[PDB]
Amino acid sequence: DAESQIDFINQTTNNGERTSEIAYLEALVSTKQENVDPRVTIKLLEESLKLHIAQANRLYPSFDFYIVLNPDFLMSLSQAYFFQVGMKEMLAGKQPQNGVASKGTKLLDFIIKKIPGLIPAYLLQAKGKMSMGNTQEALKSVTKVIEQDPKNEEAYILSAMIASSSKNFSLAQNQLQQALSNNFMIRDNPLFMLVKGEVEYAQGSYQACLETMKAAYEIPEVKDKANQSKVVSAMSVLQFSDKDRCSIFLLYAKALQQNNNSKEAKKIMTQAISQFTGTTEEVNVLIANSEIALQSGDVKKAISILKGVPQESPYFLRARQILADVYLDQLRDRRNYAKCYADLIEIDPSFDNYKMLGDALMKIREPEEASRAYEKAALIKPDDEQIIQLLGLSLCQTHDYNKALTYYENALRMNPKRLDLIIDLGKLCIQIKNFNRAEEILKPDIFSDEYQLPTYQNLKRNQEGFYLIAKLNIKRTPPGVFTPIDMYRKALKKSIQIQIDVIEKAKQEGEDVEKERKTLADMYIELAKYTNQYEKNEKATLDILAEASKYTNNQDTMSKTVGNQEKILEL
Amino acid sequence: FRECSRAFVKLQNLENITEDEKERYEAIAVSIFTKHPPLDSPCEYTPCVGKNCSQQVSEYDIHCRACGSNFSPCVASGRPIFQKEFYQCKNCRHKMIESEVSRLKLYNCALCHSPIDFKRFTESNNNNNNNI
Ligand SMILES: [Zn+2]
Numbered sequence A: 001d002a003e004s005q006i007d008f009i010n011q012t013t014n015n016g017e018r019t020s021e022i023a024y025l026e027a028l029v030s031t032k033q034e035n036v037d038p039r040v041t042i043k044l045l046e047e048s049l050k051l052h053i054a055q056a057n058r059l060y061p062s063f064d065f066y067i068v069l070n071p072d073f074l075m076s077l078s079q080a081y082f083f084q085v086g087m088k089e090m091l092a093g094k095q096p097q098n099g100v101a102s103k104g105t106k107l108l109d110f111i112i113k114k115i116p117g118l119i120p121a122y123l124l125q126a127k128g129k130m131s132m133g134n135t136q137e138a139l140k141s142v143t144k145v146i147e148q149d150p151k152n153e154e155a156y157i158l159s160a161m162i163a164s165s166s167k168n169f170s171l172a173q174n175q176l177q178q179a180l181s182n183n184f185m186i187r188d189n190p191l192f193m194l195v196k197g198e199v200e201y202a203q204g205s206y207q208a209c210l211e212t213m214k215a216a217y218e219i220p221e222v223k224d225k226a227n228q229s230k231v232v233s234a235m236s237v238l239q240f241s242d243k244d245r246c247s248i249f250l251l252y253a254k255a256l257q258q259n260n261n262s263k264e265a266k267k268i269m270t271q272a273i274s275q276f277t278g279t280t281e282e283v284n285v286l287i288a289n290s291e292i293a294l295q296s297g298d299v300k301k302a303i304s305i306l307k308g309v310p311q312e313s314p315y316f317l318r319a320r321q322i323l324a325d326v327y328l329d330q331l332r333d334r335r336n337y338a339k340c341y342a343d344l345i346e347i348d349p350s351f352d353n354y355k356m357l358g359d360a361l362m363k364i365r366e367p368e369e370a371s372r373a374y375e376k377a378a379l380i381k382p383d384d385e386q387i388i389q390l391l392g393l394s395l396c397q398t399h400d401y402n403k404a405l406t407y408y409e410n411a412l413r414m415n416p417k418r419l420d421l422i423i424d425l426g427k428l429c430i431q432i433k434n435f436n437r438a439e440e441i442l443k444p445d446i447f448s449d450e451y452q453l454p455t456y457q458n459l460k461r462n463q464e465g466f467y468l469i470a471k472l473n474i475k476r477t478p479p480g481v482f483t484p485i486d487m488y489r490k491a492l493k494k495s496i497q498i499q500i501d502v503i504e505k506a507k508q509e510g511e512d513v514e515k516e517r518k519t520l521a522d523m524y525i526e527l528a529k530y531t532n533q534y535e536k537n538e539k540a541t542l543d544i545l546a547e548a549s550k551y552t553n554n555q556d557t558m559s560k561t562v563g564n565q566e567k568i569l570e571l
Numbered sequence B: 001f002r003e004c005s006r007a008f009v010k011l012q013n014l015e016n017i018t019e020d021e022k023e024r025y026e027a028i029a030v031s032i033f034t035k036h037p038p039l040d041s042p043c044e045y046t047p048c049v050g051k052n053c054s055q056q057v058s059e060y061d062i063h064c065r066a067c068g069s070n071f072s073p074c075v076a077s078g079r080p081i082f083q084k085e086f087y088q089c090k091n092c093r094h095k096m097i098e099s100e101v102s103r104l105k106l107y108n109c110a111l112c113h114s115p116i117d118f119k120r121f122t123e124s125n126n127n128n129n130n131n132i
C-alpha cells in the first residue's frame, strides 16, 4: 500500500519538488523487498540526506533549525543505513564493501557533534563503530552513554558485546552483572538473553548457557514471526529480528550438542529447519545442518546436503569450500580435496574458477597443475595483472627456471611498467646465480621510479628494490675480505629510512604494521652484525642495537615476539 | 626429476623449519635444477587394468587419476599389480606376484612370514577367483 501511494504521489507530482521524506520512504520500501539491489536503497538514502542537509545548511542554528535539522530523522536515516548490515557481518568487524556502515557512523558523528546529549545517537554510533571493526571507539561511545546515563541497560549490554568480541570475558561479565541488577523485565527481552547465552557459551559455561537459552526458548519465538511481520512496539537501537531468533535456535542446538544431548539438538534443529525455510535462512540452516551432522559423526548426510545445493544458489561456493575443508581433515586425502574445486570448474567455467583452483593447488603445493590452471585463466582474462603475477610466482616455484625467465623477459617486453614483475625477475635471477643480469635489471628500474613518492605501495616497492640491491651487493663478496663496503651501507640506510616512512604511512591509514616493525628490527640486527663483522665500532653498534631494542618495544610485542629480543641480547 | 621436484617442493616447508635448514634446502634444490633442467625419463606406458579407459597410466604411478581405481601393493617388491597373477595368504591378505616370488624364491610371505607353501596359496587363490 505504501509503495502504491508513493507511486501515486510521484505520478501526480511529475513536476513537484523532490523532498527528503519521499526519498526516505522509497529507501524504506526498497529495504522491505527481498529482490531489490542494496545500491538503490543506498542512493535513495544519500539523496534524502543530501536534500535534508541542503535544507538545513542555508541557515544558522537556533531552535527552528534543530527543528528543520530533525535529529530524529537523521537518526532514522542512520538506522536505515545500518539495516543493510547483517548482525554476523556486524559482529565480525568486516565492513561491507559498499561502506554503508561508515556513512551511518559519520551521520551519527555529525549528530553527536551538534547534539552531544543524544544517548541513542551514541548507542547507534558505538554499534556502527563495532561494525567497522573499531571496538575501542564503540567502547568509548558506550562509556559516554554510561557516564551520561548510569542506568542505561543497553549501554552495559553493548559494552558486554564489545568486551566479548575482544575476548575480554571478565569485563563482559562485569557489564552483564550490572545489567542483571539494572532491570528485571529485560530478562524477558530476547536480545538480552541471546547476548547472555552467547557470552556464557564463549566462557565455556555450557550449563548456564543451556539454562539461559531454555528460558530464552519459552519467550515469544513462535510469536516472533507475527511480531516481525507486524512490528508495532516501542523499539530502539536494539531491535529483535528474525536473524536473532535464528541465532538463538542455532546456538541452542549447539549448546545441546556440547552437553552430549544429541537427540534434543537434532529435534530443536529439525524444528529450526522448517521454521526459516524460504529466505536465505533456509540455506543458512542447511549449512548448519551439514555442520552439526558432521559434529554428530554422521558425515554422509552432511556431504549429501552440501552436494545437494544447486548451481543457481549464491552460497554454492561456500558450501563446496566447507565440504572440502572437512574432507581433507577428517578423511585425510588430498585427491577429493582438489576434486572439490575441479568439479566447480568443469560444472561451469567462469572468470575466477581457475583462480581459486590455483589457490587450492598452492595450498596443497602442486605447482604444475596450478600453473596450467593459471595459464587457462590468463587465456580467459585478457590482461588481469594479478593472474600475471600469480603465473610468474607459480613458474618460479615449479623449479623450471628457463621458462619462468623467458616469461618474465616477455612480460617486461610488453609492459615495462610493472614493478612487481621486475622484483620477481630479480629474485629469480639471483636465485639462478646470475648477478650481472640481475643488477643490470634492478638498477635502472629502481633508480627510475622516483615520481610517485606519496603512494604507499610504490614506496614499499622502492624499499624492496633497495633491499634486494643490497642483498645482491653483499652476495658478491669473496671470502676473506675485511674492507667496509660503503655503498651497501648507504643502500641499507636508504632502505631503513624508507621502511620508517612506510610504517608511518601504515599508521595514518590504520593498518597493522607490527610485521613491518619486526622486519625493520630484523634489518637493524643484520646491519649491526654487518658493521660489527669488519670494523670494531663498538659505540655505534651499541647505539644501533639500543635503538633497535626500543623500536621493537611498541604495541604488544612484549609477549608475542620473543626471538627478536633473544637475538638482540645475544648480540 | 619430476618426482624429485615434487619431493623438494614438499620438503621446503612441512610444518616448521629453521631458517638455516630451509636455506641449505633451496641451495641444494638450485644446484640440482640449475646444473641441468628437469628431464623426464621415458619408460613404458603399460595399458591400464583398473578400468576400461584406453588412457595408459605410467608404470610408477599408482594414483590412477580421473579413474579413482587405486592399485593394490605387492609386498614382494613394491611393483603395482598389473596382471592376473596375484594371490594372498589368510594372515595378511596382501597381493603377491608369482613372477617376483619365483625370481626371489620366497618360501614365506614377505610381510607376515606365513610358513606355508606358496604354490598351494596360488592354487587356492585361483580357485577363489573362479568362485567369484
Ligand atoms: Zn585407469
Ligand SMILES: [Zn+2]
Pocket: B089, B091, B092, B093, B094, B109, B110, B111, B112, B113, B114
Ligand atoms: Zn602374508
